[PDB]
Scaffold this motif. Structure first.
Motif, PDB file in Angstrom:
ATOM      1  N   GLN A 204       0.737  -1.098  -0.005  1.00 35.31           N
ATOM      2  CA  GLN A 204       0.036   0.041  -0.045  1.00 35.31           C
ATOM      3  C   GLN A 204       0.880   1.251  -0.037  1.00 35.31           C
ATOM      4  OE1 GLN A 204      -2.576  -0.365   3.313  1.00 35.31           O
ATOM      5  NE2 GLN A 204      -3.759  -1.979   2.373  1.00 35.31           N
ATOM      6  N   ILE A 205       0.506   2.199  -0.711  1.00 35.12           N
ATOM      7  CA  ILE A 205       1.328   3.447  -0.866  1.00 35.12           C
ATOM      8  C   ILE A 205       0.130   4.468  -0.931  1.00 35.12           C
ATOM      9  CG2 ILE A 205       1.510   3.385  -3.270  1.00 35.12           C
ATOM     10  CD1 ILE A 205       4.057   5.114  -2.888  1.00 35.12           C
TER      11      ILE A 205
ATOM     12  N   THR B 209      -1.661   3.376 -13.565  1.00 31.28           N
ATOM     13  CA  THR B 209      -0.779   4.361 -13.710  1.00 31.28           C
ATOM     14  C   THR B 209       0.979   3.948 -13.531  1.00 31.28           C
ATOM     15  OG1 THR B 209      -0.423   6.810 -13.503  1.00 31.28           O
ATOM     16  CG2 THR B 209      -0.870   5.455 -11.570  1.00 31.28           C
ATOM     17  N   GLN B 210       1.729   4.956 -13.717  1.00 31.08           N
ATOM     18  CA  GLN B 210       2.983   4.523 -13.702  1.00 31.08           C
ATOM     19  C   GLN B 210       3.640   5.858 -12.749  1.00 31.08           C
ATOM     20  OE1 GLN B 210       4.550   4.145 -17.595  1.00 31.08           O
ATOM     21  NE2 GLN B 210       3.202   2.037 -17.758  1.00 31.08           N
TER      22      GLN B 210
ATOM     23  N   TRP C 258       3.864  -2.483  -7.151  1.00 33.42           N
ATOM     24  CA  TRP C 258       5.068  -3.196  -6.867  1.00 33.42           C
ATOM     25  C   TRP C 258       6.321  -2.490  -7.227  1.00 33.42           C
ATOM     26  CZ3 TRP C 258       8.214  -4.529 -11.070  1.00 33.42           C
ATOM     27  CH2 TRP C 258       7.576  -4.244 -12.440  1.00 33.42           C
ATOM     28  N   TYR C 259       7.312  -2.500  -6.306  1.00 30.17           N
ATOM     29  CA  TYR C 259       8.586  -1.917  -6.327  1.00 30.17           C
ATOM     30  C   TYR C 259       9.410  -2.665  -7.365  1.00 30.17           C
ATOM     31  CZ  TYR C 259      12.920   0.299  -5.116  1.00 30.17           C
ATOM     32  OH  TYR C 259      14.127   1.043  -4.888  1.00 30.17           O
ATOM     33  N   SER C 260       9.995  -1.710  -8.407  1.00 31.26           N
ATOM     34  CA  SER C 260      10.677  -2.153  -9.517  1.00 31.26           C
ATOM     35  C   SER C 260      12.104  -2.102  -8.892  1.00 31.26           C
ATOM     36  CB  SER C 260      10.470  -1.354 -10.832  1.00 31.26           C
ATOM     37  OG  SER C 260       9.166  -1.504 -11.360  1.00 31.26           O
TER      38      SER C 260
ATOM     39  N   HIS D 151       4.806   0.690 -11.042  1.00 29.88           N
ATOM     40  CA  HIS D 151       3.904   0.453 -11.867  1.00 29.88           C
ATOM     41  C   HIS D 151       2.655   0.171 -11.118  1.00 29.88           C
ATOM     42  CE1 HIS D 151       6.712  -0.910 -15.259  1.00 29.88           C
ATOM     43  NE2 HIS D 151       6.557   0.253 -14.952  1.00 29.88           N
ATOM     44  N   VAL D 152       1.593   1.123 -10.862  1.00 34.31           N
ATOM     45  CA  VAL D 152       0.381   1.048 -10.000  1.00 34.31           C
ATOM     46  C   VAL D 152      -0.557   0.312 -10.738  1.00 34.31           C
ATOM     47  CG1 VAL D 152      -1.231   2.340  -8.441  1.00 34.31           C
ATOM     48  CG2 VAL D 152       0.916   3.157  -8.586  1.00 34.31           C
TER      49      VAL D 152
END
Lengths: 321, 49, 246, 76, 49, 300, 294, 49
Positions: free
Chosen positions: G93-94, G108-109, G290-292, G276-277
């Motif tokens: 979650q962010i 969205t990105q 997810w964190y790239s 990448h949301v």
């Protein structure tokens, strides 16, 4: 004799992918009891013991790599290797039913033909695994022309480290590793790491300090540089170890290869061929975890580094200049 | 040739409660300490003249 | 079997290492709490005498104290090193260490509480600490009369059970002994605080703790019994620097 | 992990530290002086040929030291 | 400048400004406050011997 | 432990004719606009972005594919399709049914590209729902970085011949572009010059660079004279053409030049990423008689 | 499986003033140096590279940001800061509290950028401990590029001056903004420009002649919406290069090299780690992503 | 262990050599030095213990 078959009843039913979490709704809230590995804070006592935490150790992440099975001529792949070298799959055209061509970085040093002083250690070692350089040049007749227009970095697909190799007289089988930690065949419960010769590796982060942040990640980069020596085209492969991120190391690799850019491009004040302008490429050989010490070795001498906990994740070839 | 022995250290643990340092402290076992935000002690001092 | 049972020995000895590296965390941080609140002698000694603070901290009285912070540092610092070169010697340490002893404000709510005691019911005043080099010095100059003390065997409990949990969930506070606090206001009002009755409420369960037999060193200084402990064994077996060495 | 709540009960001061026993002098009391060329390297003289001369007449460089860890002095 | 009772509380717990390094070749200033245990009685007294 | 399955329901039953075309490609890689298991039809193709009524795009598809989630067919049951979910770094199996047929070999890098060829090769029209599903053009990366290039050159000389006949020979143009050599083999692609509106946007961008880049790099060389110049830039003055260095920069004013340099960089990062980074995956095993390639997907 | 938690010891009780700003930003992303549970406060800030008396260089600060691990806050207790961790690749979650507010949606990105608009707004100083804490800015990838596009243009046109409306304003649909440049160290922002002089003049040497002749046929009469840069007049240089005759197999070798060097311009226009949301809630301002990896 | 608790740096070794000089000059032939001191037996005992 079925006791031997009762072993395969244990091991195969014990070693499976974990099944999908599917519980019918009529059972109720039993499914919350079927979630154990998401629980990550185990209780401790005054004197904890294994019997208090044998359930705690039982949940482990799911790690299984995907291997590669290559059938190689016994001439190209030298019959003795330190079982953790890095590989390359060179590919030109499917001419046979199933014959494949594999290149260790000692072997690609022989097809290169650079001067001895660029790599003063491996030249003796790679000169005794092979002939004078025509034993491997017979299979690729275009090594003069593949260097001019610059297609050689498009024909290499990085594979990873070795796992197993059963050797015969004419045909050598090679079992390679992708996606991560390859399981060691001969020694049980061991893990094969990636080994590089100390001569080919070029470290990048080195300071007096005269501070850099830590992390979980450091990424080995492959490099391959088109150059000209004795007015003949030849290649040069170097490695990099850095955790600076991709936006820095492309600027850092330019500072390492400054002289190689300068000594080549003196020539093109006279002749400007657009095919000659392509210079080098950088792939990503996968991540290394932080603070693992690369341990020096000695083989025959040849000093060879080793990386425990190596995982592989191949990337594209991008043309830096 | 021969092995003559395997000699190994044993770490005897020293409890805080059985040091004589703990006379300088008052020790209370408190179960759930992550739940607490702030502790507070109030003094009332009368001063006669 | 001997590979399996030789593997269960390793993981316990890795995990007994886990708990007993955390029990050193107590002895570190408790000693680290004391040193944050420990001013030196030469600052605190002249504040110990009330004869200057009777007139108040005026403009001139602050200045006269400063010359006594100065003069006490020049002479009496490194007091155990000067004692070897004086003719007086053993009396000079015994006065100066007792002059350290009477300068400490011992004002404690738990002063009537029964706590760590010697043999024959005499009372422990406090605990000094040295290094190993100073410990043998003070052991020669001063006798170790008992070398034995009694004390608590376990900790005391404090649980948020009862009506404490009602105020913990609904409100945001947890009362210290709410059942002891409730009877004073509504059940037994208008009673002045009497010390011999308040002490049972002030004991807070430090009475009824089982006593035990604790092995440590003692010393006799004036009217006060002091315990002596040098902590280098818990620091130099782990090869960390000691905070007593400044 | 383990978490501690530690309070201070006493109103007055309850712990007293003291200097007890001298062991060693590490300062060595050396008469080396601090070089202001190192602190303020940007400020320099107008003629850069002359500023490289006075720097020649003053001066990691020590591989070893005998009497102890050397200490800087100043000039007022 | 403040009251001296506050300066006694600030003397032990607050390693004051501009300290000197230890055990390293020249007199450097220490910025890493994790280890260094030095107590300097030269600020509160404002002297030099 | 984790379960993944993507089940798409429909409103109307399929025809008997359209079922044989989906059974033709029982293994494929579809894009999919949502991560949840139950989903409507309108996302699983390229019909959400690309359609007949809308103008055909390249770049807005290539913006879409890197943002989109991929999925693989397992079983086609009327009317409820059954896709399987793609995970980051997961091993699964692909059958290679894409028109026209390019040959896959093991240890190649699969690059998902949008379809720019004819309609009947790419799509399968679903007449029951009236919606078009579009299968992407799965091509190996070295072809995919070359099958685009000769067509994008071909689109430029089509624009020159339509404006002026004397500059472009058709026999010189056809023989050098529609014939693609790779892996020793050849491929004669479908030109579809019957009327290439897909690649018109890339034909605009690369040309607008080609006039502004030599106008751009002159000002950026002269503005960076230092004692701390990076020493490799002294070499690259010999690389620029001599005609480029003779621009009088007094002709364009300062308010014009800030507009140019912001136009200069803003095309560059928008054009670099759409050549570089899409959903791209690896294959470690292949068999020609079974036409099944075991794969694994690497995001970004 | 895996745990992720960083709890930060702190040596002084925080004031009610500075706790009210930290209670305001309970969902926020800040980088920190090491990977441990316990951590000193001198690693939590981004201000180890961006302090007040040090002249900041926002390229080097952004260069700094890709090295470090990133972390999300959970609680702000009045003694200890408590944070959670981001590892590739993990869903989490962010929640955007970020003050120059933009609107997101599902699919969205994102990107993480240093504060480039208002430092005083996006950094709070801690007078109790004496060390200040600097917050980065999360930006969608289009404006993630477009702010870096303007800052590279700015250091070009501050060196020529050895005015502000063209150089310091980042454009976007509906809004215009002000970059924060009062004290910038250009030397780490000019080495990026030093490599731009390398790539851009190589691309001026291998120019396709047919794609130059396309603009000579286009911009004189055929006017299009996205060719208004040239304003209807050809540049003087473009008439000079087109004197040669066209041939196909010249440009086939050229356009592949034009293609291969635009692969390199990824490496100089990189952002930080990307985000990448997949699902974003609107009224709650929470998200999931997810964190790239870098 | 109070000396080498930091690790044998270059600052510790010179402190450890400068005490080799000051102990060899002062306390050597200690039974010969005790024939002329005022204290006497205390000098032998605090040397040998």
């Amino acid at each position: 004799q079925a006791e031997n078959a009762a072993r395969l009843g244990r091991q195969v039913l014990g070693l499976l992918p974990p099944p999908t979490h599917r519980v019918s709704l009529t059972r109720g809230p039993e499914f919350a009891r079927g979630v154990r590995d998401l629980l990550s804070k185990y209780a401790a006592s005054t004197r904890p013991t294994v019997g208090s935490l044998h359930e705690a150790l039982r949940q482990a992440p799911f790690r299984q790599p995907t291997y590669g099975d290559f059938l190689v001529y016994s001439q190209t792949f030298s019959p003795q290797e330190p079982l953790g070298t890095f590989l390359f799959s060179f590919k030109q055209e499917d001419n046979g039913s199933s014959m494949d061509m594999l290149l260790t970085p000692t072997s690609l040093f022989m097809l290169s033909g650079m001067e001895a002083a660029k790599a003063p250690q491996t030249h003796k070692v790679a000169g005794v695994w092979y002939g004078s350089g025509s034993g491997l040049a017979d299979f690729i007749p275009n090594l003069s022309e593949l260097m001019d227009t610059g297609e050689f970095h498009t024909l290499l697909t990085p594979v990873g480290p070795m796992v197993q190799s059963v050797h015969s007289t004419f045909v050598t089988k090679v079992t390679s590793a992708m996606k991560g930690v390859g399981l060691a065949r001969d020694e049980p419960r061991a893990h094969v790491g990636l080994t590089l010769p100390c001569d080919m590796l070029v470290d990048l982060d080195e300071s007096c300090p005269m501070r850099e942040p830590a992390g979980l990640n450091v990424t080995i980069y492959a490099s391959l540089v088109y150059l000209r020596v004795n007015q003949r085209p030849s290649m040069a492969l170097t490695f990099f170890q850095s955790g600076k991120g991709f936006a820095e190391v492309v600027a850092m690799i330019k500072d390492h290869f400054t002289d190689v850019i300068r000594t080549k491009y003196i020539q093109l004040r006279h002749e400007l061929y657009i095919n000659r302008l392509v210079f080098g490429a950088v792939c990503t050989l996968g991540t290394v975890p932080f603070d693992s010490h690369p341990v020096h070795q000695s083989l025959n001498s040849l000093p060879v580094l080793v990386f425990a906990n190596f995982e592989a994740a191949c990337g594209p070839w991008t043309v830096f200049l | 040739e021969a092995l003559l022995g395997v000699y190994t250290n044993v770490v005897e643990f020293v409890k805080f409660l059985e040091t004589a340092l703990a006379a300088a402290c008052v020790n209370t076992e408190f179960k759930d300490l992550r739940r607490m935000i702030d502790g507070k002690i109030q003094f009332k001092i009368s001063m006669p003249t | 079997f001997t590979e399996y049972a030789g593997a269960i020995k390793t993981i316990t000895s890795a995990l007994q290492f886990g708990m007993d590296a955390l029990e050193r965390g107590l002895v570190d941080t408790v000693l680290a709490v004391k040193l944050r609140h420990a001013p030196p002698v030469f600052i605190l000694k002249t504040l110990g005498d009330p004869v200057y603070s009777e007139r108040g901290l005026k403009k001139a009285v602050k200045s006269d104290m400063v010359s006594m912070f100065k003069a006490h540092l020049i002479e009496h610092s490194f007091f155990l090193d000067k004692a070897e070169l004086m003719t007086r010697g053993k009396q000079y340490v015994l006065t100066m260490l007792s002059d350290m002893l009477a300068a400490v404000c011992e004002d404690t709510v738990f002063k009537g509480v029964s706590t760590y005691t010697t043999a024959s019911g005499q009372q422990v005043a406090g605990v000094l600490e040295t290094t190993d080099s100073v410990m043998r010095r003070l052991m020669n100059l001063l006798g170790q009369v008992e070398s034995a003390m009694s004390g608590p065997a376990a900790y005391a409990s404090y649980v948020v059970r009862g009506a404490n949990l009602v105020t913990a969930v609904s409100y945001g506070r947890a009362m210290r002994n709410f059942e002891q606090f409730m009877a004073r206001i509504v059940d037994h009002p208008n009673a002045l605080p009497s010390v011999e009755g308040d002490k049972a409420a002030l004991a807070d369960g430090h009475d009824e703790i089982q006593r035990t037999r604790i092995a440590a060193s003692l010393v006799k200084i004036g009217d006060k019994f002091v315990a002596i402990e040098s902590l280098q064994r818990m620091y130099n077996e782990t090869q960390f620097p000691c905070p007593l060495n400044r | 992990t383990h978490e501690i709540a530690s309070l201070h009960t006493a109103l007055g001061y309850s712990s007293v530290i003291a200097p007890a026993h001298v062991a060693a002098i590490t300062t060595d009391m050396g008469v080396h002086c601090q070089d202001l060329f190192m602190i303020f390297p940007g400020d320099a003289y107008q003629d850069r040929q002359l500023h490289d001369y006075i720097k020649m007449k003053a001066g990691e460089n020590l591989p070893g030291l005998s009497h102890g860890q050397l200490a800087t002095c100043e000039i007022i | 400048n403040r009251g001296l009772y506050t300066l006694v509380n600030e003397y032990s717990a607050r390693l004051a400004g501009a300290p000197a390094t230890s055990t390293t070749d020249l007199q450097y200033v220490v910025v890493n406050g994790t280890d260094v245990f030095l107590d300097q009685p030269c600020h509160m007294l404002q002297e030099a011997y | 432990a984790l379960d993944k399955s993507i089940v798409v329901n429909l409103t109307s039953r399929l025809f008997a004719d359209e079922l044989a075309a989906l059974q033709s490609k029982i293994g494929s890689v579809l894009p999919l606009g949502d991560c949840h298991r139950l989903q409507n039809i309108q996302a699983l193709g390229l019909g959400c972005v690309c359609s007949r009524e809308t103008s055909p795009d390249y770049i807005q598809i290539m913006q879409y594919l890197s943002k989109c989630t991929l999925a693989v067919l397992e079983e086609v049951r009327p009317d409820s399709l059954r896709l399987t979910r793609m995970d980051p770094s997961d091993n699964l199996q692909i059958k290679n049914v894409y028109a026209p047929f390019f040959q896959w070999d093991s240890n190649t890098q699969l690059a998902v590209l949008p379809p720019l060829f004819s309609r009947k090769d790419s799509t399968i029209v679903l007449e029951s729902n009236g919606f078009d599903i579009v299968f992407p053009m799965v091509v190996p990366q070295q072809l995919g970085h070359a099958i685009l290039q000769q067509l994008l050159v071909y689109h430029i000389y089509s624009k020159i011949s339509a404006g002026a006949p004397g500059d472009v020979n058709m026999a010189e143009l056809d023989l050098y572009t529609t014939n693609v050599s790779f892996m020793g083999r050849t491929y004669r692609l479908d030109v579809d010059n019957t009327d290439l509106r897909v690649l018109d946007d890339l034909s605009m961008y690369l040309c607008i660079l080609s006039a502004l880049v030599p106008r751009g790099c002159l000002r950026l060389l002269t503005a960076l004279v230092r004692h701390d110049r990076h020493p490799l830039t002294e070499v690259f003055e010999g690389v620029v053409p001599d005609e480029v260095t003779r621009i009088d920069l007094d002709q364009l004013s300062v308010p014009d030049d800030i507009t140019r340099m912001r136009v200069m960089f803003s095309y560059l990062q928008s054009l670099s990423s759409i050549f570089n980074l899409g959903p791209r995956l690896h294959v470690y095993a292949y068999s020609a008689e079974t036409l099944a390639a075991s794969c694994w997907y690497s995001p970004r």
